[PDB]
Amino acid sequence: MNVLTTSSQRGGKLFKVTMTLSPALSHHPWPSLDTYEPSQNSYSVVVPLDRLLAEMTYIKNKGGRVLDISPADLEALGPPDISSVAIPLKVELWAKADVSDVQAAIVAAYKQIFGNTYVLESERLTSAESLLRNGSISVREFVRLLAKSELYKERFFFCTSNNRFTELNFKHFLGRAPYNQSEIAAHLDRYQTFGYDAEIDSYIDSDEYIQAFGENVVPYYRGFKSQSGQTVESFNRMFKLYRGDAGSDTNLNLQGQKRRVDPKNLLRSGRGIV
Amino acid sequence: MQDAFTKAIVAADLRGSFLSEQELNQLTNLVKESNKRLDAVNAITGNAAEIISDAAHKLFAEQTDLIRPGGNAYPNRRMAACLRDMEIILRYVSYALLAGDASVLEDRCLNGLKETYVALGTPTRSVARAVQLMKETAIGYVNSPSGVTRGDCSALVNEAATYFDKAAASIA
Amino acid sequence: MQDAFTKAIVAADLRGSFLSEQELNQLTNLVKESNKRLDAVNAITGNAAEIISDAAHKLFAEQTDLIRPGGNAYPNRRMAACLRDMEIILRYVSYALLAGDASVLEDRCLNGLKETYVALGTPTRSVARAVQLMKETAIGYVNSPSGVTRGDCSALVNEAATYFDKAAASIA
Amino acid sequence: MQDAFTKAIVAADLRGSFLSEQELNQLTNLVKESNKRLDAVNAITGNAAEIISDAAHKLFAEQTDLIRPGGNAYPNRRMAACLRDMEIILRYVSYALLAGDASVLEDRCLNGLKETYVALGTPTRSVARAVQLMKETAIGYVNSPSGVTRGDCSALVNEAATYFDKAAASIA
Amino acid sequence: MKTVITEVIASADSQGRFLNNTELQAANGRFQRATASMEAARALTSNADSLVKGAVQEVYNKFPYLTQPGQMGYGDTNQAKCARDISHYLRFITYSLVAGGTGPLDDYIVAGLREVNRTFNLSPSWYIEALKHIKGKVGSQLSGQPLTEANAYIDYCINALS
Amino acid sequence: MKTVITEVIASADSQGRFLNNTELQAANGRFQRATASMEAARALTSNADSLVKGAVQEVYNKFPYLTQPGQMGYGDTNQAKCARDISHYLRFITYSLVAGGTGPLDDYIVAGLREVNRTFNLSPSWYIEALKHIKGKVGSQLSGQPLTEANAYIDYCINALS
Amino acid sequence: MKTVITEVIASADSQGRFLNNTELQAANGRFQRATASMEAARALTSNADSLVKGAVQEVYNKFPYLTQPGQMGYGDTNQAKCARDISHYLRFITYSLVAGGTGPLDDYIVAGLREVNRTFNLSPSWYIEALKHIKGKVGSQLSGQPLTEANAYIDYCINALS
Amino acid sequence: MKTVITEVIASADSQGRFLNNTELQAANGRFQRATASMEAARALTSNADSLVKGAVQEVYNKFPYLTQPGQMGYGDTNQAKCARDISHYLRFITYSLVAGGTGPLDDYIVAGLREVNRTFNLSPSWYIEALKHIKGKVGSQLSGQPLTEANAYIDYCINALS
Ligand SMILES: CCC1=C(C)/C(=C/C2=NC(=C\c3[nH]c(/C=C4\NC(=O)[C@H](C)[C@H]4CC)c(C)c3CCC(=O)O)/C(CCC(=O)O)=C2C)NC1=O
Ligand SMILES: CCC1=C(C)/C(=C/C2=NC(=C\c3[nH]c(/C=C4\NC(=O)[C@H](C)[C@H]4CC)c(C)c3CCC(=O)O)/C(CCC(=O)O)=C2C)NC1=O
Ligand SMILES: CCC1=C(C)/C(=C/C2=NC(=C\c3[nH]c(/C=C4\NC(=O)[C@H](C)[C@H]4CC)c(C)c3CCC(=O)O)/C(CCC(=O)O)=C2C)NC1=O
Ligand SMILES: CCC1=C(C)/C(=C/C2=NC(=C\c3[nH]c(/C=C4\NC(=O)[C@H](C)[C@H]4CC)c(C)c3CCC(=O)O)/C(CCC(=O)O)=C2C)NC1=O
Ligand SMILES: CCC1=C(C)/C(=C/C2=NC(=C\c3[nH]c(/C=C4\NC(=O)[C@H](C)[C@H]4CC)c(C)c3CCC(=O)O)/C(CCC(=O)O)=C2C)NC1=O
Ligand SMILES: CCC1=C(C)/C(=C/C2=NC(=C\c3[nH]c(/C=C4\NC(=O)[C@H](C)[C@H]4CC)c(C)c3CCC(=O)O)/C(CCC(=O)O)=C2C)NC1=O
Ligand SMILES: CCC1=C(C)/C(=C/C2=NC(=C\c3[nH]c(/C=C4\NC(=O)[C@H](C)[C@H]4CC)c(C)c3CCC(=O)O)/C(CCC(=O)O)=C2C)NC1=O
Ligand SMILES: CCC1=C(C)/C(=C/C2=NC(=C\c3[nH]c(/C=C4\NC(=O)[C@H](C)[C@H]4CC)c(C)c3CCC(=O)O)/C(CCC(=O)O)=C2C)NC1=O
Ligand SMILES: CCC1=C(C)/C(=C/C2=NC(=C\c3[nH]c(/C=C4\NC(=O)[C@H](C)[C@H]4CC)c(C)c3CCC(=O)O)/C(CCC(=O)O)=C2C)NC1=O
Ligand SMILES: CCC1=C(C)/C(=C/C2=NC(=C\c3[nH]c(/C=C4\NC(=O)[C@H](C)[C@H]4CC)c(C)c3CCC(=O)O)/C(CCC(=O)O)=C2C)NC1=O
Ligand SMILES: CCC1=C(C)/C(=C/C2=NC(=C\c3[nH]c(/C=C4\NC(=O)[C@H](C)[C@H]4CC)c(C)c3CCC(=O)O)/C(CCC(=O)O)=C2C)NC1=O
Ligand SMILES: CCC1=C(C)/C(=C/C2=NC(=C\c3[nH]c(/C=C4\NC(=O)[C@H](C)[C@H]4CC)c(C)c3CCC(=O)O)/C(CCC(=O)O)=C2C)NC1=O
Ligand SMILES: CCC1=C(C)/C(=C/C2=NC(=C\c3[nH]c(/C=C4\NC(=O)[C@H](C)[C@H]4CC)c(C)c3CCC(=O)O)/C(CCC(=O)O)=C2C)NC1=O
């Protein structure tokens, strides 16, 4: 039932389903009380298209809750290829820029900071780019400017929860997944009492940020490689965070901007207080 | 499964209490309006086929893309699936209406439904619309019926719509 | 499923080797202490009901929250589920104790268990505690039984404890 | 399931059209070469066992780690599973070759396969290689058989190769 | 949770079917019956305090030995947990009265009853005797169809415990 | 999608088995038959326009009343959707001819047919009469095994509708 | 992995049941019998290799055409892989002796045996003859219940190959 | 009927394999254990008379009220049926001792126990107390592995009743 092979038999579109079952579907044949196996708390099964409506109806009745439906063939092509991003290409802006040296930087900051969503030409931050070109600001300075912009506020903040925002923030600004439940919490409390702007500053003035990017380096991916003071399970979070080269942050998804890192998963790396 | 009484009972129990005189009379009123409720559920059952048919005719009148090749209500197999879903949703809305509680609708029908449709490529906005049309027509029939004592059946009419609107919201 | 011998065999095979004289005598010692082991497993089987009951009485003595509406060992259905889980865990701990290896416990009982309870809203810390109480009483029985030959069972009492402690750790 | 004609039909239908004279003659050509196709499928069926065996002998000649303890084609149980998978893949490649379309191969065999092997700890690069060896030998047979009429089968040998290459790519 | 309404809906759903005249007739029974049920409910609700103390005592009067030291009707905690338990039963009886079915009793007291009582050394006999007493006194708080309803559910608990 | 090729492959797969002489003999039938099938297909393809207008009209000539006001053969939209529907049938007939089996008909017109026709108040009789007419005219566009093929599939639709 | 201990535990688990006197009596058998088993194990362990070279050769002496060129008992690699294979069998025999059951043999040699031998053109007859020889020599390394144990498992392999 | 012998045979049959050396020791355990078991059996057999009268009385001494009029330890027939019932338990204990497993207890006393006791208003507490007493006295009739066996089965009955 778990992770599948194949798609169809006569022909179908197999969908794999996931639920949470009562002892009504599955119980042991024991002398007392009806219980399902504790590890099949959420169970998944792959069903071809016709049997599918009948299965969902049954599951819902006897008590289960469907958690997901997704085609099997989507889910057979693995996990993302990460070769492009295991070790990236760094882009850095020099002291006397060359006229297109600076062109390189802007295109990359865009891609990285905005998480590969398209920024259309009406959309670009032109006045701010003027500034970088003249040297009035530096690459880190410019990077902070994009984050406080409406375009950044609008595709990533306004329409999703704070859990999601912060998780995106780590990906964009720091290039790495969020290590702890404390990190999520520490941030949510800051936004709540100092506002959005103070909270944005907190990733860009951090010691972690400063070491790796310094000030003239565009933030680049770095979570597919071992880092310091990183729990070990933050390397699996990175797969959940980045879905491949053609994937992007996208707020235009049918289901909306949502999570990607399970809250349960974060707790595995440690729980304390505050 | 819950009905309006069962819901009261669950909330009372979570307090560790016998039902409040507040809750008692809310339920006495549901019994008071129950003949009207039975007529309202009967209005839907007695016109189920036409409610689905009329919703359908109108859905495809508006969205002629669904019945072109490439469209999600083409060919016959897909149209039959779409007609079937219209019936399934109208059915659970009528159950909720007999029950005085949305839970059967949310638990057996709406739970997971949006994600099913997205997996399938079924345009949820079109499905939401088909539900809005069923609502219009379903609410229509109850008002003018054959030989029933004159009175105000109006309050009852509001109970249906939120169930139709729950389904629409849940799916779009 | 593994037992203490089977475990030895799997590690030997991964070297491509006949069992080391090291491993041989470790297993000869297991056979040496096996009568004591049988008494230890028998101590648990012979008092299973009381071990669960006594753990239970004490769990709810400490934590009245579960006993009150809103609590995870209320009403009768939930208490029966909780009593049943206490038995299931005590059962797999006794199996591990006959086997000289934790694997049956980890593979058939502990694997996924925490995530089950969290999905259910079952307070894992309370479940961990119920396991700690079963341990106290179970070992009590392993140490003070009916006309067993006098000797030292501390090695086995430790090993039983680690199985109780595995379960607790895995769940909390 | 699709074959080369069925594929044409699905693309035509998505236009809302009767098959193009373009598509018609592409399919007339498939009928033109169909005796050769039958011989090509027959070449594989008639030597399936040797194709698997010879691929196998050579896979383990190259990768002597798989047949050591610790290796994924050790002990007999695992070798039988590996021999079985070689047969399964050769089987779906022959089906695709009769069909003139890869879909049965992709849908019933390749879909999810890589993730299965990774879950299992089966070295996908070794599996890819076993597929490359089956390809060499299978095509060998397609090209040099028992008293078949002399002609040019290179088009079919290519197409068979792409099915072997699809599988390899999908798995590695 | 078993009520006339949930039962007919369950039966329709499981045949993929709209509610029909069979099912709506059934529902009318449950609604027509609400008045008697809810009168029983109100009477049992306001007398709860004394119905519980009456039945608790009767358990000790019928099983005198329970109240001696070393026994399970001794000390504040046993006697407290007893009152509570009978109160749970009366509570679910009122719920079953109000709900139009045994659901609340089935889900919150019957499912699991014996396993629990057996682990905790609680004899059903006490509980039957608590309920037999409650049944005696409810003879003069109600009459007609409210009494029949009260009786239906009290008896339902006594059969669950035998 | 049901063709001779998919059928034999399905039967092999389901027994975990390579294609054998039984299955390859079958395939040769489908390939040997392609010439007649595809001649029928080309003739039905180029005459489509008129075959459709011929059958549409015949539905009105056999059911005169359909074309009166308040009826389902009246107004541009009904008469338009009719031509389209017969065109769908001829289209899938050509597909079934080209494919070597009923698959295209089974998957795109037969699966669900009655439910749809019943919800939309479409009588099969019209469609049978459209097809009976198409069958009459195809008598002089084809002959021999191309006609037999055309007939096979037209008749298959008529049986699907009875 | 099948041992007396795992078997009784499996049987308890599958009935949702604590180990009882039936199951503990069984376990005592396995523990009481460890001494003889483990003596056989130590003797088979230290007197090991030569058994492999003896049996390998005997396969060629009984199937002379084997050690001739073009055959499967010729060249370093065949003769090397043979010694290895008999060594695998003796290894799992010792494991089965030590484990208290056939598990190691069932899981690592029996499951899949015929499929593998059939794909690789390995005749069971060789392996039976290797084992028959090993059985002859083990007659004078052991006696009493250690010999019976050694025999039990050697014979188990011979039956697996017939 | 569950014995070590029947269990291993059941497991083979369901699995189709010859009784082999893994299994033989299970059986050897049961046979090696027979001496202690059967000593317990002989001692419980000849003391039966008094073990039964001792336990019967102890039920009344621990539940004094049982022997008052209107109660279930009063009159010749109740007190007669009690002795009989404890005698049934001791009888099946001896059978389980002799048989090498809990089978006789499982089939003749455990299967159905609670349903019967619940219909007839028989409290398990009595029976547990009968058995606790029998366990006290069997402390000085036996020792060593015969006592452990006697205990195993007495305790098995007490757990069946809790
Ligand atoms: C593999 C062996 C195995 C285990 C271990 C197991 C655990 C398990 N415990 C469950 C429920 C439960 N477990 C408990 C346990 C407790 N409640 C408390 O408050 C206490 C802290 C604790 C008792 C110490 C309760 C109350 C439920 C019911 C939860 C509910 O339905 O609301 C369920 C859901 C199915 C059911 O209710 O039968 C599973 C699968 N199932 C298994 O098959
Ligand atoms: C705060 C708002 C703001 C202003 C006002 C601004 C001015 C500004 N103008 C610049 C360049 C420039 N500005 C001009 C403007 C002109 N050339 C002419 O011959 C005309 C006289 C005149 C147009 C009327 C030109 C040609 C450059 C490019 C100079 C070069 O790179 O050689 C630059 C260097 C960075 C860049 O090229 O983007 C800055 C910062 N930047 C800002 O962020
Ligand atoms: C998008 C807007 C937004 C919401 C709604 C939000 C919720 C939210 N609540 C959190 C924690 C929390 N929320 C609560 C709330 C409660 N505790 C209780 O017992 C009560 C029932 C309840 C108060 C009524 C507590 C106690 C925590 C801390 C949990 C812990 O760390 O142990 C966290 C983890 C991060 C953190 O601790 O800062 C998030 C993301 N975050 C957001 O950004
Ligand atoms: C690695 C290289 C790479 C690829 C290939 C890529 C694909 C890609 N296409 C996207 C959107 C899109 N792609 C299309 C494309 C189409 N719409 C149609 O109807 C046609 C069938 C089709 C054009 C032929 C459309 C319309 C969207 C916007 C969807 C939306 O926001 O609603 C998005 C979401 C982010 C965004 O909108 O910028 C990604 C990531 N992104 C990448 O970085
Ligand atoms: C619990 C009760 C229940 C519901 C609600 C349900 C929905 C549901 N609708 C489905 C398909 C479908 N649903 C539709 C519906 C539509 N197509 C459109 O274009 C319109 C917008 C819409 C009609 C208003 C279509 C066309 C399919 C078939 C999709 C396909 O196979 O391509 C399927 C896949 C299984 C199947 O095709 O039978 C499920 C499970 N199943 C259930 O058991
Ligand atoms: C078999 C299932 C079943 C049905 C259908 C049922 C109907 C039913 N409708 C009733 C009343 C009624 N029904 C209506 C209904 C209407 N009044 C109008 O003017 C509108 C056209 C229509 C709106 C829906 C009205 C106004 C009454 C009288 C007021 C009342 O009893 O609430 C009554 C009370 C007796 C009476 O006054 O006739 C019953 C028993 N009872 C049942 O057991
Ligand atoms: C039916 C399955 C079965 C059981 C249960 C079994 C028990 C058993 N326990 C034994 C010894 C013993 N058992 C114990 C056990 C203990 N000593 C203590 O002080 C602790 C309270 C307890 C710790 C577990 C000790 C100390 C011995 C004597 C030393 C030994 O033989 O290892 C012996 C050796 C004979 C004897 O000395 O009495 C047997 C046969 N044999 C069996 O075939
Ligand atoms: C849809 C058709 C289909 C395919 C393709 C399939 C693959 C497949 N291969 C499997 C195992 C396996 N596959 C292999 C294969 C190999 N080992 C190696 O070292 C080599 C590199 C390779 C042979 C070339 C092995 C050794 C296992 C057993 C893994 C284990 O249990 O440890 C399993 C797990 C179930 C089982 O063991 O039977 C599946 C599902 N199953 C299917 O139903
Ligand atoms: C039982 C199922 C079945 C099979 C297998 C079948 C085979 C078959 N292969 C044929 C031809 C042939 N087959 C081949 C095949 C090859 N030429 C080569 O040099 C390559 C080694 C090989 C590549 C695959 C060629 C070249 C012809 C002659 C040209 C043609 O007819 O297309 C012919 C035409 C008669 C002939 O020329 O012999 C038949 C009937 N017919 C059937 O009904
Ligand atoms: C929701 C429905 C529900 C019921 C019915 C229920 C019964 C129930 N009674 C209990 C205990 C108890 N029940 C009693 C009952 C009595 N003691 C006396 O003085 C009398 C003889 C008798 C009253 C007639 C006693 C003494 C205990 C304490 C048992 C113990 O923990 O030793 C417990 C154990 C947990 C606890 O200690 O509270 C449960 C679950 N629990 C529930 O959740
Ligand atoms: C892929 C294969 C396929 C078929 C066969 C098909 C049939 C089909 N015919 C329909 C309607 C229709 N069909 C007709 C048919 C006719 N009107 C006349 O003048 C004649 C009597 C007759 C032609 C013989 C009419 C009038 C409608 C409109 C029905 C309505 O919406 O009221 C509809 C409803 C959606 C729509 O309004 O287009 C379907 C699905 N749809 C498909 O996707
Ligand atoms: C874990 C238990 C286990 C067993 C038992 C086992 C048997 C086994 N023997 C093999 C080959 C072999 N086995 C032999 C056997 C012999 N050659 C001779 O000289 C004699 C006639 C005979 C010894 C009696 C030969 C020659 C090969 C090479 C076959 C080949 O690849 O052509 C292979 C193929 C992989 C390889 O080439 O190593 C397996 C899997 N593998 C295992 O993993
Ligand atoms: C084969 C195994 C087996 C068992 C164990 C068994 C128990 C058993 N005890 C019974 C009755 C009884 N059991 C007792 C028991 C007692 N009375 C007392 O004085 C004491 C309190 C207590 C003894 C500790 C009494 C009084 C009855 C009569 C119950 C009645 O019919 O009212 C009955 C009802 C049939 C009958 O009246 O004989 C059964 C079946 N029957 C069996 O076939």
Q: Which string of DSSP letters, residue by residue, matches F69-114?
A: TTSTT-HHHHHHHHHHHHHHHHHHHHHHHHHTSSHHHIIIIITTHH
Residue H55 CA: distances (Å) to CA of F151, H49, H69: 93, 10, 21
Examine chains B and H and say if they touch (3+ CB pairs below 8 A).
no
Q: Is the CB of H80 under 6 A from ligand 13?
A: no
The Cβ-side half-sphere exposure at C160, using a 13 Å CA radius, reads 29
Closest alpha carbon to A112 in A234, A243, A221: A221
Binding-face residues of B in 71-90 toward D, CB within 8 A:
none
State the Rg of chain G over Cα.
Answer: 18
> Considering its fold, how many domains does chain E have in total?
1
Nearest by Cα to D100 from D150, D26, D45 = D26
Given its phi and psi angles, is residue A23 left (phi above 0), alpha (psi -120 to 50 degrees) or beta? Answer: beta
Domain range for H127? 1-162
**Contact status, residue E47 vs residue B50, Cβ threshold 8 Å:** no
Q: Is H122 in the pocket of ligand 13 (CB under 6 A)?
A: yes
Token output for G131: 């084992």
Q: Is F6 on the interface with D (CB under 8 A)?
A: yes
F37 and F97 Cβ atoms separated by less than 8 Å: yes
Per the CB < 8 A criterion, the answer to whether E27 and E5 are in contact is: yes
Q: In this structure, are residues G108 and G99 in contact, taking their beta carbons and an 8 Å threshold?
A: no
Cα F113 from Cα F119, distance rounded (Å)? 10
Residue B42 Cα, ligand 6 centroid: separation in angstroms? 10
What sign for the dihedral angle of Cα D158, D159, D160, D161?
positive
What is the C-alpha to C-alpha distance for residues B1 and E112, in angstroms, rounded to an integer? Answer: 20
Residues in chain G: 162
Burial class (CB in 10 A: 0-12, 13-18, 19+), A97: middle
Q: How far apart are CA G134 and CA G50, in angstroms?
A: 10
Residue A23 per-residue DSSP state? B
Contact (CB, 8 A) for G90 and C17: no
Q: How far apart are CA B165 and CA C8, in angstroms?
A: 64
The CATH number assigned to the domain holding D33 equals 1.10.490.20
Q: Which residues of A touch C118 (CB under 8 A)?
A: 264
Per-residue HEC secondary structure of H128-158 comes to HHHHHHHHHHCCCCCCCHHHHHHHHHHHHHH
Inform me whether the C-beta atom of residue C16 falls under 8 Å from chain B C-beta atoms: no
> Which amino acid, B11?
A
Pair of tokens at residue A247: 């994937």
Query: Does any CB of chain G come closer than 8 Å to the CB of residue H94?
Result: no
Strand partners for A45 = A17
DSSP A79-132: S---HHHHS----B--SS--SSHHHHHHHHHHHHHTTT----TTTS-HHHHHHH
Domain count of the fold of chain C = 1
If you count them, how many residues does chain C have?
172
> Any idea what the Cα angle at residue G20 is, between residues G17 and G22, rounded to 5°?
120
Q: Whole-angstrom Cα distance, residue A142 to residue D11? A: 49
Q: What angle do CA A21, A27, A31 make, to 5 degrees?
A: 145
Asked whether A244 and A81 are in contact (CB, 8 A), the reply is yes
Distance between CA atoms of residues G133 and D7, nearest Å: 62
Contacts of F124 (CB under 8 A, 6+ apart): F117, F161, F162
H22-39 in b/e burial notation, b at 16+ Cβ within 10 A?
bbbbbbbbbeebeebbbb
Tell me the residues of chain E between 12 and 51 that have a Cβ less than 8 Å away from chain B: 12-13, 16-20, 23-24, 27-28, 31, 34-35, 38, 41-42, 45, 48
Which H or E run includes F34? helix F21-46
Query: How, if at all, do strands A42-48 and A14-20 pair?
Result: antiparallel
The answer to whether B79 is annotated as binding is no
Burial class (CB in 10 A: 0-12, 13-18, 19+), A29: exposed
Q: Residue C121: which residues within 8 A CB-CB, separation 6 or more?
A: C72
In degrees and rounded to multiples of 5, residue H72 shows phi and psi of -95, 0
The letter for the amino acid at F40 is A
Contacts (Cβ under 8 Å, ≥6 apart) of E107? C75, C77, E1, E2
Minimum CA–CA partner of A73 in chain B:
B119
Residue A15: phi and psi, rounded to 5, are: -115, 140
CA–CA gap between residue B1 and residue G140 (Å, rounded): 76
Instruction: State how far the Cα of C37 lies from the Cα of C26, in Å rounded to an integer.
Output: 15
Exposure pattern of A180-198 as b/e (b: 16+ CB <10 Å)? bbbbbbebeebbeeeeeee
Q: Are the beta carbons of H12 and H19 closer than 8 angstroms?
A: yes
Instruction: Report which protein residue has its CA nearest ligand 7's atom 14.
Output: C36
Query: SS3 breakdown of chain C: % helix, strand, coil, rounded to 5?
Result: 75, 0, 25
Which DSSP symbol is given to E67? G
Provide the 10 A C-beta neighbour count for residue F16.
Answer: 10
What secondary structure does DSSP assign to C39-96, as a single string?
HHHHHHHTTHHHHHHHHHHHHHHH-HHHHSTTSTT-SHHHHHHHHHHHHHHHHHHHHH
Length of chain A: 274
CATH of the domain at G48: 1.10.490.20
Sheet holding A66-71, edge to edge: A42-48, A14-20, A66-71
Q: Going by C-beta distance under 8 Å and a sequence separation of 6 or more, which residues neighbour residue A146?
A: A109, A110, A113, A114, A125, A128, A152
Q: Are H86 and H130 in contact (CB under 8 A)?
A: yes
Way it was determined: cryo-EM
3-state secondary structure of A32: coil
Query: What is the separation of C-alpha D62 from the centre of its chain, rounded to a whole number of angstroms?
Result: 22
Burial profile D44-66: b = 16 or more Cβ within 10 angstroms, e = fewer: bbbbbeebbbbbbebbbeebeeb
Measured CA to CA, the distance from residue F34 to residue F100 in angstroms comes to 7
G8, G14 Cβ separation under 8 angstroms: no
Contact A222, A212 (CB under 8 A): yes
Dig out the tokens for C169 from the structure.
Answer: 């750790």
Residue C39 lies in domain:
1-172
Residue nearest to atom 15 of ligand 13 (CA): H82
Q: Where are the alpha helices (DSSP H) in A162-233?
A: 162-169, 181-204, 207-213
Query: What's the CA-to-centroid distance between D8 and ligand 5, angstroms?
Result: 27
Helix axes D154-171, D76-99, angle to 10 degrees: 140
User: Distance between CA A66 and CA A21 in Å, rounded?
Assistant: 9
Cα–Cα nearest to A50, from G109, B90, B80, D155: B80
* Interval between CA B81 and ligand 5 midpoint (Å): 5
What's the one-letter identity of residue D46?
G
Q: How far is CA A224 from the centre of its chain?
A: 14
D115 alpha-carbon distance from chain centroid: 19
User: Do residues C72 and C122 lie in contact, with contact meaning Cβ atoms separated by under 8 Å?
Assistant: yes
| Sequence-ordered list of residues with C-beta below 8 angstroms from that of B76, at least 6 positions apart, any chain | F108, F109, F110, F111, F112, F113, F116
Residue A270, token pair as written in the block: 């440690």
Contact A37 C115 (CB under 8 A): no
Which of A2, A3, A6 should be substituted to probe chain D, the one whose Cβ sees the most D Cβ atoms within 10 Å?
A6
> A12 C-alpha vs ligand 11 centroid, how far in Å?
27
What the block records as the tokens of H57 is 């009385």
Cα separation, G100 vs G1, whole angstroms: 10
Categorise residue F71: left if φ over 0, alpha if ψ from -120 to 50, beta otherwise.
beta
At D90, list the tokens: 């050769």
